[PDB]
Design an enzyme around this catalytic site. Structure first.
Site, PDB file in Angstrom:
ATOM      1  N   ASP D  44      71.837  53.731  58.177  1.00 51.50           N
ATOM      2  CA  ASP D  44      70.522  54.276  58.480  1.00 51.50           C
ATOM      3  C   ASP D  44      69.487  53.158  58.495  1.00 51.50           C
ATOM      4  OD1 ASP D  44      68.299  55.818  58.901  1.00 51.50           O
ATOM      5  OD2 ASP D  44      68.393  56.893  56.993  1.00 51.50           O
ATOM      6  N   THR D  77      64.158  56.131  63.679  1.00 50.62           N
ATOM      7  CA  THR D  77      64.079  54.935  62.849  1.00 50.62           C
ATOM      8  C   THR D  77      64.542  53.710  63.625  1.00 50.62           C
ATOM      9  OG1 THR D  77      66.283  55.343  61.935  1.00 50.62           O
ATOM     10  CG2 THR D  77      64.402  56.281  60.762  1.00 50.62           C
ATOM     11  N   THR D  78      65.827  53.672  63.983  1.00 53.68           N
ATOM     12  CA  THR D  78      66.367  52.525  64.703  1.00 53.68           C
ATOM     13  C   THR D  78      66.008  52.554  66.185  1.00 53.68           C
ATOM     14  OG1 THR D  78      68.207  52.368  63.136  1.00 53.68           O
ATOM     15  CG2 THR D  78      68.476  51.274  65.262  1.00 53.68           C
ATOM     16  N   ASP D 367      68.322  64.585  58.265  1.00 52.31           N
ATOM     17  CA  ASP D 367      68.165  64.486  59.711  1.00 52.31           C
ATOM     18  C   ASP D 367      68.726  65.710  60.423  1.00 52.31           C
ATOM     19  OD1 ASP D 367      66.938  62.058  59.383  1.00 52.31           O
ATOM     20  OD2 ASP D 367      68.707  60.863  59.893  1.00 52.31           O
TER      21      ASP D 367
END
Lengths: 479, 505, 63, 502, 444
Positions: D44, D77-78, D367
């Site tokens: 993550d 996020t990424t 998530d």
């Protein structure tokens, strides 16, 4: 092995970016100070790269590319260097993605061949039978030269000179067969075609020289009239020439000994044999082509079959000139050539005038190989990128990304033209692509035209240049 | 690049510390402290790794991985670290020559590890011979566990049920193959054993009570009263009847999925939720039997004994893995409806129905039974051995070479390199024993390559000899434990692309 | 050696500024004269700015 | 104004280049070391970016945005950081060409709005296809995030827990899922198959004295189970055994009159306090946190009683029953408080055999609960996994030639920046990023317009529409808005000022 | 010290020509102290001879490459690279593999016999249907002209070299084909002529066309030939007698005339490239041909000379040996299977030595895929799986990037060329493996 190629690309990109500022008449001039103390100033890319004495081995190839650029097309020596560096700059990000230069090199050759057919479809089709566009092409090209009003009469002289040697399928024609002899005195308004031949020097100024002869034979002779009793030795020399009835003697210029003795001048005066000495070594090969003769080293090698024919050989009277002309070579085997005499009062006139006629003959010769012309000013560079935008989506694999970067490198040439003119770089380029939906090649009303061979050869030479640059993976010392 | 170097060169340098200590003839190592007077000498591989402080953040991961082998089994801990270090030596050659993400290579190890476990099973032997002596010892130990437990009322009847629930399995000993039914109003001595998988709360009303040549399908859907919570959604309708019509249109699209059920050639369908009468009425004309209240546990235990699979969606018709049972009988016992399955393909399982007098006696009987079956079934995977002496290590090598025949382009080198790491075990044992690893291993592979090879590593004569004549065998549980631990050990290290330096203490 | 960019542009301005600052004193009839010394050590005194630039030794392409 | 524009691009690129290899299910993990000495490994990006402590002024904007992404979406996020770095790399080439930085900022804003309208035409409906197909998306929503872990064997059990939990805490009116209404609690030990879904707060308690019953009796058919919430400790009045015992009989009458079955307080209890509560069948609960009291009143529909005199029967929390259920082999023996009615809050109960498995399962469930909220809030969805970025690229690049001016190059650079994600997914999948990108563009033009993405994990074939791989449209729409919002703030700051360390 | 310098020093020799192997290869540049002698060429023999090397072990491969250049003239790069790959793997065979150095030598000896047997079983020749054999000569000529500038017009040059060899029908000696290089015109303008074009004229002034001439090398002769020059007076006396004298006849020209004639029907003088030429006609069973190449510049002709001479030298050997094999990485792949096949029964110390030779056979096609812009490990591994068990036809494709048949694409190789490469390269590697020390005498 990438450290060798990346070092050569960065070194060559700095050279291309340095010449990039010299594009256009308003471009930045580069200064080079030789070790001997000589300093030259000019925007010519072929002169800068020649006098730079580049130690980098791969960067020296740009001199050979610029040499073939002026020899084939005759224009774009600065633009071909910019286009070469544009592909090298775009190849830096290609190596970062893990692409081997073989695909990079093979894609440039395939993209250069397809770019030619795109320009031909958008080019205006013209023919050599119409002299309207042939005169206006050379007249507008001389607006960058000292000649202005006299350039109107110089255009048709260059058109009729090429149309005789162009024929139809002859395609490329050697430019070395066209000799421009500059001499002090006279003016530009006085011009003579003299399709037979023209020499570079005057005739004998001593006493007894006829300086004019009618119905004479011309041949190349490497012999020299010199003493070893002396009049008897020179009599057999003049007698053997009389056997073949050669009334015109051409002696190769040499600082070793003299040309013709004064005692032999009285012997040749009775025979009415005209002598022209101080023949340069460069004209030895020239006279052996148009006249169809052969260089003769000794007196025994001299024969009648190697002698040509000349209607009238005379020395034209002019101020500080005295130019000798020959007409009616009457040779079926040797094809005729064009030799134009350049006259003027100042030495700086006949100098730049000769160079100005070089660019005028090249552009006309560009129409001989491939007919048609493309309006300059960044039009052909942008038009190709417009066609490659939708074509890049039709490809597949690694090559699909190359078509997008190839069109991006073509935008460097029109961008530099806007920078050197003081206008905003991006703003001018966007205005050209905005009107591209309506107009296509439209510069036509400004009487600014460019031949198609310059834009074609610039892409072909730059595609092979960059192709050969990526082929060197190592640099070794071999003596 | 230093992240993989610390995970490889840093790990190999630590792995080579206990590498020379493999085997009784292996080397030894001294562990020196700061004062140097507290030092000690030992051949233990787990002691040397844990005692030496390691500032390498990648080496600290290998220590936690080795602790799994000690807690699960506790034998062959050194062989796990040595084999895991040899996998890094082959993985380093695959990466540096590629420089592609190792996760693709990791997938090649999973396909190669499956072929290695299959080769060990065909050549596996056992000490289970003369089961008559083992059965008499199994019933005596089972009665010992019954002490202090309420099941001690009758030892003979309960130990006999557990005896027939183990030796008759001939397969996995997992408790998922043993179903426990707990009912009220009965006696413990009246318990019986059934080989069929038994449910409760019989399905359907007008459905028949007997099904011949039944097929099993697993799916999850709600055919009854869709749109659970309609509160909060804006409803614009001219009449109330349009609200119920919307649910019919949503269930109308389910007819295509119902049609795919009939295309499977199955006579029975299983669903966790309920089913409305209209889609259930269509099951009668199409010959579909609707089973309800299958929950989850009972679904997984049924799919394994019948050779089926579980899926909650339909990817494509006529593609699935289905189970089957010959006869389904619906009976009633203990005032509750029961279900009975029989005739499963390769079905191996049993059901123990215990009758208690209350809920407290039922819960204590099932928990005490699992503790007794766990000890008895522990001997099934124990004492079972395989042919040793480097043979089985080379048998796994040639088994991977069989997988190297049909393989992808990028997975050809990943799978082939796994067989090279398996041949590094006899190379290390030959160097620690003082022999030539190049001469012995090469001659050992040539013989075992094709056929009729009983030969193995003989350290007494320093040559290749038959291990079956010398009686050299090693446990099969040790074989699977080391390979499974080394396979998971390589995954933890390779899946890490970048390693942040640990905080120095 | 090769120097490009704004570094050589500032050096060309300072070079011509140094040459200019020398002849600013001789501008006009009220201006001041100067002495030009050679390698021999001799010199001369004149108020004419035309003869100064001819005898002044400066090594620079713009000079 | 000189070295700032070049340094900001290289600083944000080096930080974003860390998580580029971790994007996708095949993305490689990393070894993180806490300052206390604990080693953690996870894929993550939120965990990796939050643990970064750095003085770089440009990289701090990645941490400030990542905090808001977990609550709004959690999957950005990424993906957003890699997408934000793509806009910065394309902006670096424009700065060298003389393009104004605010024009680059405004150029990406107008280009992002045009790409949203293009996906609005090509998106598909879920509930319009079928009702049960919507639940099939929820069952396979957590399977994608858990497919790379050992949890993928039991994944079928965790799929049903997220379906029933969101329906209770979220109403179809506002369609909002509050993170504070979902209590995430887990412990080490046991297995992942024993995880159960609880409709209310857990509130583990040992029931004080062992003689107290482990279950709550209905008390002659009484309605629900009444609990007392006390924000004040239980002590005798002060500015001996019989004195304090007599004072305790007056305060317990408030419980008997109100009829509270269990007493809950924030502070500990005395020994004699449990003696009177034992004979009255009143289990005592002590040592309760302040935040735990908020989850009690929301699930049981109770109120906060500030003092002893304000205790009333209407403010008592009502539940179904309170019993102690043993969980696995753990000796803690926790308890379960049920409801049987729909509440406004739930508590997630997750267990695992390893400390890392518990932490990885709680974050993966976080998530998964957010995807369900986006599917209900927006029925229109698109197919991700590389198919959405290629569709947005061909849409902006096609409209680039139609829009003249300076924005023509702003649309081309924005379309090339969108190609970073599918190429990154292609690089993270072990395939040629350029060769794969040309394949996805060829199938969406010459054949027909559809969604075909890059496969990070090995599948049967392409065209994820056949495999029913769905991503929320509003979830992907929130990612491209935060990417353009972050790219502007980086360009809107040309100054760097930092002091020393004293 | 000597083994470390001999192994690394020989690899550096192969690293110079590693880019010159294959049609997709790249050109190497060299620069001397004068810096004006730099020349761009891919010739492997030119790179090895021009670059000085102080390594005495590296000088051995230089003289061996000269022997390989005299027999054929091509494939000299593949011999050096293959010899370097055997030494690169030998470093791992000695140190960590515990193998005796002589065992490595005996390992290549047993492995060389398996490689030759693989080429023999894969060699297929067609005696019937000479038209099919002519097409094989066309495909072989395309592989010889590869890596050279002639690859552009090679499609037109394929029938030039193929039809030229068919006009010999006799000894393999290359003195029958004379190469004449004239400036001007495109490369595609070259033609095949059997009339023996001569670059020198005869006499001062003499008739151009001569009928019923009698050639006499030095009577009643119409043509005279002398090796030295001719004095003035007899040159005029020979004209009155009807005898035409030829001058400037070197040793190479006399040997070519002895293979043709003597008498000849017609001697015609033609003018091409601004120089008198002599085209003979009506010889007696002429076995000699003349190929006139038209280049743009002298640098193009200088590279085309040895390019055509090396291509015709291989086609000349195809007359004695008609067996052909499939190339383009397929030949080295088939031999790699025979090495692993004989590895089933082998000794302990010879096992790793022979198995290392199998990986060395795949290193040659690995570099071929490197210069082609493709992935070697990806493409070769996909082909190796198909060649592993049966059904061996297709081979590495350097253009499209997929697995395609070499017979359909027209890529074949001669059997005599491959057996010479495997031989000379094996003997070249055995010499360097034997030398563990080098002692040089004190020079004067």
């Amino acid at each position: 092995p990438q450290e060798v190629r990346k070092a050569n690309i960065i070194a060559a990109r700095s050279v291309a970016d340095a010449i990039r500022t010299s594009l256009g008449p308003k471009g930045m001039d580069k200064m080079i100070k030789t070790s001997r103390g000589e300093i030259i100033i000019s925007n010519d890319g072929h002169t800068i790269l020649k006098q730079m004495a580049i130690l980098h081995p791969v960067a020296r190839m740009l001199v050979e590319v610029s040499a073939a650029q002026d020899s084939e097309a005759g224009d774009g020596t600065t633009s071909v260097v910019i286009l070469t560096g544009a592909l090298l700059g775009a190849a830096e990000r290609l190596l970062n993605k893990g692409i081997h230069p073989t695909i990079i090199a093979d894609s440039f050759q395939s993209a250069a061949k397809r770019s030619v057919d795109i320009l031909l479809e958008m080019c205006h089709k013209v023919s050599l039978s119409d002299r309207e566009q042939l005169v206006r092409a050379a007249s507008t090209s001389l607006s960058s030269k000292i000649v202005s009003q006299y350039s109107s009469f110089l255009a048709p002289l260059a058109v009729d000179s090429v149309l005789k040697i162009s024929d139809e399928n002859s395609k490329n024609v050697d430019l070395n067969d066209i000799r421009l002899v500059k001499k002090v005195g006279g003016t530009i308004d006085d011009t003579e075609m003299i399709d037979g031949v023209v020499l570079t020097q005057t005739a004998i100024k001593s006493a007894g020289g006829p300086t004019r002869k009618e119905k004479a034979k011309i041949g190349l002779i490497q012999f020299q009239i010199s003493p070893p009793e002396e009049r008897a030795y020179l009599l057999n020399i003049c007698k053997k020439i009389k056997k073949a009835k050669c009334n015109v003697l051409l002696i190769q210029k040499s600082i070793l000994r003299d040309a013709v003795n004064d005692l032999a001048l009285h012997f040749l005066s009775k025979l009415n044999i005209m002598v022209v000495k101080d023949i340069e070594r460069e004209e030895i090969e020239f006279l052996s082509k148009g006249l169809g003769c052969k260089p003769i080293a000794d007196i025994e090698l001299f024969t009648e079959d190697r002698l040509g024919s000349a209607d009238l050989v005379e020395e034209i009277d002019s101020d500080g000139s005295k130019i000798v002309r020959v007409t009616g070579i009457r040779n079926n085997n040797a094809r005729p050539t064009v030799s134009v005499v350049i006259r003027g009062a100042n030495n700086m006139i006949i100098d730049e005038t000769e160079r100005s006629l070089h660019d005028a003959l090249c552009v006309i010769r560009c129409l001989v190989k491939e007919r048609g012309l493309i309006a300059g000013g960044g039009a052909p560079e942008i038009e190709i990128s417009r066609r490659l935008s939708k074509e890049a989506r039709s490809m597949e694999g690694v090559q699909a990304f190359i078509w997008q970067e190839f069109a991006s490198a073509l935008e460097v040439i029109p961008t530099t033209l806007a920078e050197n003119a003081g206008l905003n770089s991006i703003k001018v380029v966007t205005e050209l692509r905005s009107k591209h939906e309506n107009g296509e090649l439209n510069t036509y009303e400004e009487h600014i035209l460019q031949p198609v061979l310059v834009s074609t050869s610039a892409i072909t030479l730059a595609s092979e240049c960059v192709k050969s640059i990526l082929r060197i993976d190592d640099i070794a010392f071999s003596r | 690049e230093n992240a993989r170097l610390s995970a490889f060169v840093g790990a190999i340098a630590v792995g080579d510390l206990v590498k020379s200590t493999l085997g009784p003839k292996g080397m030894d190592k001294l562990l020196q402290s700061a004062s140097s007077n507290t030092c000690m000498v030992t051949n233990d591989g787990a002691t040397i790794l844990k005692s030496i402080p390691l500032d390498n953040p990648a080496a600290k991961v290998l220590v936690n991985i080795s602790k799994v082998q000690d807690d699960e089994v506790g034998d062959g801990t050194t062989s796990v670290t040595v084999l895991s270090a040899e996998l890094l030596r082959e993985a380093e050659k695959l990466i540096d020559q590629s420089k592609i993400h190792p996760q693709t290579i990791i997938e090649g190890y999973r396909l190669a590890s499956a072929a290695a476990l299959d080769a060990l099973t065909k050549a596996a032997v056992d000490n289970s011979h003369d089961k008559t002596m083992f059965r008499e010892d199994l019933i005596h130990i089972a009665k010992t566990t019954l002490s202090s437990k309420i099941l001690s009322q009758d030892k003979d009847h309960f130990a006999e049920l557990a005896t027939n629930a183990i030796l008759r399995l001939k397969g996995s000993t997992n408790l998922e193959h043993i179903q426990i039914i707990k009912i009220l109003g009965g006696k413990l001595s009246d318990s019986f054993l059934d080989e069929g998988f038994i449910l409760a709360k019989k399905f359907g009303n007008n459905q028949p009570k007997r099904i011949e040549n039944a097929k099993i399908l697993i799916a999850n859907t709600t055919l009854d009263t869709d749109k659970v919570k309609i509160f909060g959604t804006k409803f614009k309708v001219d009449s109330t009847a349009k609200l119920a019509q919307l649910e019919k249109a949503e269930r109308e699209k389910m007819k295509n999925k119902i049609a795919k059920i009939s295309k499977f050639g199955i006579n029975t369908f299983i669903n966790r939720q309920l089913i409305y009468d209209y889609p259930e009425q269509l099951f009668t004309d199409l010959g579909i039997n609707s089973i309800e209240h299958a929950d989850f546990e009972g679904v997984e235990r049924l799919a394994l004994v019948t050779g089926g699979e579980v899926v909650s969606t339909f990817d494509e018709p006529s593609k699935c893995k289905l189970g089957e049972c010959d006869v389904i009988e619906e009976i009633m016992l203990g005032e509750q409806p029961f279900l009975k399955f029989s005739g499963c393909k390769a079905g191996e399982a049993c059901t123990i129905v215990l009758r208690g007098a209350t809920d407290q006696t039922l819960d204590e009987a099932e928990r005490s039974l699992h503790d007794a079956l766990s000890v008895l079934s522990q001997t099934t995977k124990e004492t079972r051995t395989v042919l040793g002496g480097g043979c089985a290590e080379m048998v796994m090598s040639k088994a991977v070479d069989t997988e190297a025949q049909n393989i992808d382009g990028k997975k050809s080198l990943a799978v082939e390199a796994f067989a090279r790491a398996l041949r590094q075990l006899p190379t290390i044992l030959a160097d620690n024993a003082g022999f030539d690893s190049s001469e012995l291993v090469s001659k050992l592979r040539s013989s075992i390559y094709n056929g009729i090879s009983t030969s193995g590593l003989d350290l007494n004569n320093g040559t290749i000899a038959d291990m079956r004549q010398l009686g050299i065998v090693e446990s099969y549980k040790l074989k699977r434990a080391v390979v499974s631990s080394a396979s998971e050990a390589a995954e933890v290290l390779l899946r890490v692309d970048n390693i942040i330096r640990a905080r120095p203490r | 050696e090769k120097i490009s960019g704004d570094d050589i542009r500032n050096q060309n301005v300072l070079a011509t500024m140094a040459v200019a600052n020398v002849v600013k004193s001789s501008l006009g009839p009220v201006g001041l004269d100067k002495m030009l010394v050679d390698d021999i050590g001799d010199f001369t005194v004149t108020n004419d700015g035309a003869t100064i630039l001819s005898l002044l030794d400066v090594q620079h392409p713009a000079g | 104004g000189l070295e700032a524009k070049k340094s900001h691009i290289l600083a944000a690129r080096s930080v974003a280049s860390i998580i580029k290899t971790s994007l996708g299910p095949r993305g490689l993990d990393k070894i993180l070391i806490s300052p206390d000495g604990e080693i953690t490994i996870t894929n993550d990006g939120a965990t990796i970016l939050s643990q970064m402590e750095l003085d770089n002024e440009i990289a701090k904007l990645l941490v400030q945005l990542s905090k808001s992404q977990d609550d709004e979406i959690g999957d950005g996020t990424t993906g957003v950081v890699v997408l934000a770095s793509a806009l910065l790399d394309q902006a670096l080439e424009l700065i060298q060409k003389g393009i104004h930085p605010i024009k680059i900022a405004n150029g990406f804003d107008e280009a992002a709005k045009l790409a949203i309208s293009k996906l609005e035409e090509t998106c598909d409906d879920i509930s319009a296809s079928n009702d049960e197909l919507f639940r099939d998306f929820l069952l396979r929503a957590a399977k994608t995030s858990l497919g790379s872990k050992i949890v993928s064997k039991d994944h079928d059990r965790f799929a049903e827990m997220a379906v029933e939990a969101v329906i209770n805490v979220m109403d179809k009116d506002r369609k909002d899922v509050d993170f504070d209404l979902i209590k995430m609690q887990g412990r080490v030990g046991g297995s992942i198959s024993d995880s159960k879904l609880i409709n209310g707060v857990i509130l583990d308690k040992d029931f004080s004295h062992p003689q107290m019953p482990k279950c709550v009796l209905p008390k002659e058919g009484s309605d629900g189970v009444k609990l007392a919430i006390l924000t004040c400790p239980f002590e005798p009045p002060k500015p001996l055994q019989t004195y304090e015992q007599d004072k305790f009989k007056e305060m317990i009458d408030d419980v008997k009159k109100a009829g509270a079955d269990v007493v809950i307080c924030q502070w500990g209890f005395d020994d004699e306090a449990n003696h009177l509560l034992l004979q009255n069948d009143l289990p005592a609960v002590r040592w309760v946190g302040g935040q735990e009291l908020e989850h009690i009143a929301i699930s049981t529909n109770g109120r906060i009683v500030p003092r002893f005199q304000d205790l009333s029967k209407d403010k008592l929390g009502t539940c179904s029953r309170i019993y102690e259920q043993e969980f696995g082999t753990t000796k803690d023996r926790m308890l379960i408080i049920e409801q049987s009615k729909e509440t406004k809050t739930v508590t997630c109960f997750v267990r695992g055999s390893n400390k890392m498995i518990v932490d990885e399962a709680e974050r993966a469930l976080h998530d998964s609960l957010c995807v369900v909220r986006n599917l209900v809030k927006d029925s229109r969805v698109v197919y991700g996994g590389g198919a959405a970025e290629v569709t947005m690229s061909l849409a902006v690049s096609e409209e680039a030639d139609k829009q003249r001016g300076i924005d023509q190059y702003a649309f081309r650079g924005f379309a090339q920046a969108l190609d970073t994600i599918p190429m990154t997914l292609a690089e993270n999948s072990g395939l040629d990023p350029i060769g794969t990108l040309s394949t996805l563009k060829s199938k969406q033009l010459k054949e027909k317009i559809s969604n075909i993405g890059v496969d990070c994990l090995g599948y049967g074939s392409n065209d994820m529409k056949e495999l029913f791989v769905v991503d929320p449209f509003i979830g992907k729409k929130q990612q491209i808005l935060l990417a353009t919002q972050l790219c502007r703030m980086i360009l809107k700051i040309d100054n760097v000022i930092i002091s020393g360390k004293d």
